Design a protein around this ligand. Structure first.
Ligand SMILES: Nc1ncnc2c1ncn2[C@@H]1O[C@H](COP(=O)(O)O)[C@@H](O)[C@H]1O
Length: 135
């Protein structure tokens, strides 16, 4: 449930790269306010968008969360990440959702696709579109 103004890569960045606060409850307001639902789980990779695009250059692998897909790519090393867990669901009032935060150093697996021709910048022809797994 991506908001229509974002490409998949832009939505990927919004959910997994641009952690607007080191505190999950604050950071998740962005994601939840965009998708009009409190996400149960969300990982913020403490890495850069360009770093992930280079992970898209790594050898293709089966997506562990989406077995029929072969458009995934494994990071060559562990990266710091913050994982946000829903601790206070609030379906009838998104703004009151609260999260716990778990810091960790793990690998990630991203699905990558060619860029949205009209809205994604030419600079990156291949872009991350889904965070398939942290492992
Ligand atoms: N064009 C795309 N190719 C692959 N995955 C995509 C694409 N657009 C969105 N996704 C993400 O891919 C996930 C799983 O795709 P699938 O394996 O086909 O079910 C979804 O949860 C989406 O977030």
């Amino acid at each position: 449930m991506k908001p229509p103004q974002f490409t998949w890569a832009q939505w990927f960045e919004t959910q997994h790269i641009n952690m607007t606060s080191q505190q999950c409850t604050n950071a998740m307001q962005v994601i939840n306010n965009y998708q009009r639902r409190c996400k149960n789980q969300n990982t913020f990779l403490l890495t850069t968008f360009a770093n992930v695009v280079n992970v898209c250059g790594n050898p293709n692998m089966t997506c562990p969360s989406n077995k029929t897909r072969k458009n995934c790519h494994h990071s060559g090393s562990q990266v710091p990440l913050i994982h946000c867990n829903l601790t206070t669901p609030s379906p009838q009032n998104i703004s009151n959702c609260r999260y716990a935060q778990t810091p960790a150093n793990m690998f990630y697996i991203v699905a990558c696709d060619n860029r949205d021709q009209r809205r994604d910048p030419p600079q990156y022809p291949v872009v991350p579109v889904h965070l398939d797994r942290i492992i």
